[PDB]
Design a protein around this ligand. Structure first.
Ligand SMILES: [Cl-]
Ligand SMILES: [Cl-]
Ligand SMILES: [Cl-]
Ligand SMILES: [Cu+2]
Ligand SMILES: [Cu+2]
Ligand SMILES: [Cu+2]
Ligand SMILES: [Cu+2]
Ligand SMILES: [Cu+2]
Ligand SMILES: [Cu+2]
Lengths: 320, 319, 322
């Protein structure tokens, strides 16, 4: 049932990545013991121009650090909780088979470190999130991320892998009201978010921080939805997904414009860059994208291909 | 098109189950005439601790009684509306090919019994519900369940089969406001539910009424979504779905954490219990789970496997 | 490698005929890549949104949804977006079947009484939402600027008896549901995802009565089902029917024997079933308060011979004591 036998070879100290980057393929034919260390940090960050928010984070980012292992691996998990934390925290990983996806075994007070071990029985792309009461609030404050469990043979190779995770956020104030915005439990219970974001901030993946590919390169995006409440009608403006791992499972659908990413769910999308310019990741529940912050940019650099996409060729008078 | 031809043998009086249980496989190589009998009852039940609600029910339960037939069966359906009912009721089954999926053939005023016959043309797991004006209010009051139409060859054998149905509920009062709550039509039209529940109540499937299985046993859950309005980001805390019959169709996705169940839709999930402990079915639109009542428990008992899940191994001081 | 590149267009160019909903252009039945010239006119106009309710719709081709476009994978599409001089706003087009910036929006900014031309190769078979991408994008979409383009596989779709074109939208009026008169767009309601109306083809009863869909007993029906949004996800069902096949999320592969399929905002699905029993079938958003309280219903009327072995109708009303 994911049974490749006991852990072999050297223990692996997992190299985690900050979004939107992804650890390299594990490139391994044997099951291993993987030691994952993950620090919970509560900190003010900018959520919009002139707007700050007290985020609760795995690894100092929203989403949290990307974790990458192989189906059959024994994961020795270390959840550190910085002594500056006001709150105890834990971790539920959707990749974990057992009570709380690890939550029951990872209650960690400030200035403490919980250890627990699990076998990663199933390949997939799995949300992890805090599961400390009140669970909705810990998720709302950005306590979510992704763990890739590679199939035994590994994923087909591509030029670029990217880590993107949508979240709905609940501020006392309305969209782009300046200053430190506290969390609003009432707006959260009502599923009425003030912001809908990729990677924890308006402009998180714009300008200098855009994703980059070149014409001719194949792109895989691991697309998490931490919620807490919204389901993403995930689309990239100007691309078609050649393949979607719908709901993050093993099987693919082909030639998909827009895929639904459940709350506490994920998907994998793959396409090839063919024409230069700006591509926009959106929640195509499209007021989220253009009125609440739910857009990220993939920039394609390289040669125009006018036989695939001409640009504007002609403007003319029209009388009708 | 489900053309196994004319029904053979004696008519079978279908045995329906109360949630969270399922009738056994039909275990059958021929198509039959199946008589289904289902009684509508309006009754006050506990929606939450010290909170009552006037549920409209098929067979005295939310969700209603589970119906199990084979693709190719002719179903002779008898819908009874108890004398005690204030309303007439009817049934739309999603497994029916015809107007209203039965709605038009089954208008049943209090103290009456409608007979209609249909052939189950398509295998699947199909939501049934009342389609009485106002349809929204009838569904919101608990008038939904599942009818399983098996494939000719039956479903792969498993150790446990379970019956869980999500619904959104609209009370005049707020979450956990005590007493008898009326239905609220404003909140329903605005899709702003006060409660989001599995099997018609907070704690319907908690404590002693929890789902049960042992380490090593395969579990199949038929997961309905009655709505009326919400889509379930359906997840089991602590498990992975080895197979999802996504939107209740015949083909499967493998290895999914969370599957979307349409309003008026269904899914089948399947996983093997491997570690003992409490597993929580949730709507992972997670304020529904932790703030509106959308959680049910599956308790697994059996030997620890510390190679798969150690529990907490150490607590250390960290700076 | 990229399938759906068959080299430059061959033979004489094709001047595409676009159809108004709920009809579809016929299958392309062609074995070579073509230069397909598509001409689409944007018109702003008042139409009935419900009984005695006006709305200022923004339209591709005078309808909501916009005219249906049918091309072949590998085709070279020379697009002409013509914005009528009566228009108050400039408009553009994002087709989800286009590979490149804005799916064409960056190549089609068209002021009133102007015509924009841009060219693209249709690299990907499928069923693609197109919509206006002029700011505010949600407002242009909400005013009805969305349609569907079918990019056929080279070998084309399996033949059916009837292909229909249906597209859900959520609408935002200042006034409440069925408050009479010319209803302005309500941005506040749009941002909060609280529509006054949820409709198939741009009006309550656009597909009821005389404008109902039609098919006969024994006929195969494919419906191209768009969701323009702007915000809602359709729990798409036909009352009385089962989807034999769903192209779920509009993709190449099928799910079989599906009651209700989720259609994303800015997404589409294809559903196929065979009519077997006469009567009225209802397309709905099974987020069921939309169907029965906000107008999200369309009718397929099936004419033909009663089949009593499949659906008997009501056989008996007996008295029942408990
Ligand atoms: Cl777009
Ligand atoms: Cl969870
Ligand atoms: Cl229905
Ligand atoms: Cu926490
Ligand atoms: Cu979770
Ligand atoms: Cu009823
Ligand atoms: Cu229904
Ligand atoms: Cu426009
Ligand atoms: Cu779009």
């Amino acid at each position: 049932p994911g049974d490749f036998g006991p852990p072999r070879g050297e223990p692996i100290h997992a190299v985690l990545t900050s979004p939107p980057l992804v650890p390299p393929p594990v490139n391994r034919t044997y099951p291993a013991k993987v030691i994952v260390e993950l620090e919970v940090v509560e900190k003010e960050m900018q959520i919009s121009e002139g707007v700050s928010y007290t985020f609760w984070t795995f690894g100092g980012t929203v989403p949290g650090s990307f974790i990458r292992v192989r189906q059959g691996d024994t994961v020795e998990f270390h959840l550190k909780n910085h002594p500056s934390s006001k709150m105890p925290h834990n971790i539920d990983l959707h990749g974990v088979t057992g009570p709380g996806g690890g939550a029951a075994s990872s209650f960690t007070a400030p200035g403490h470190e919980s250890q627990f071990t699990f076998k990663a029985l199933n390949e997939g792309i799995y949300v992890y999130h805090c599961a400390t009461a009140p669970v909705g609030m810990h998720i709302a404050n950005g306590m979510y991320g992704l763990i890739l469990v590679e199939p035994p043979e590994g994923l087909p190779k591509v030029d670029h892998e990217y880590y993107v995770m949508q979240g709905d956020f609940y501020t006392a104030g309305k969209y782009r009201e300046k200053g430190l915005q506290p969390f609003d439990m009432e707006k959260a219970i009502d599923e009425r978010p003030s912001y809908v974001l990729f990677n924890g901030a308006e402009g998180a993946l714009t300008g200098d921080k855009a994703l980059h590919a070149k014409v001719g390169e194949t792109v895989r995006i691991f697309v998490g939805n931490g919620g807490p409440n919204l389901v993403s009608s995930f689309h990239v403006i100007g691309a078609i997904f050649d393949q979607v791992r719908y709901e993050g499972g093993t099987n693919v659908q082909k030639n998909v414009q827009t895929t639904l990413i459940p709350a506490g769910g994920a998907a994998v999308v793959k396409f090839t860059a063919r024409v230069p310019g700006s591509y926009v990741l959106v929640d195509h529940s499209i007021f989220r994208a253009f009125n609440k912050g739910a857009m990220a940019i993939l920039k394609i650099d390289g040669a125009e291909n006018k036989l695939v996409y001409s640009g504007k060729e002609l403007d003319s008078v029209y009388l009708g």
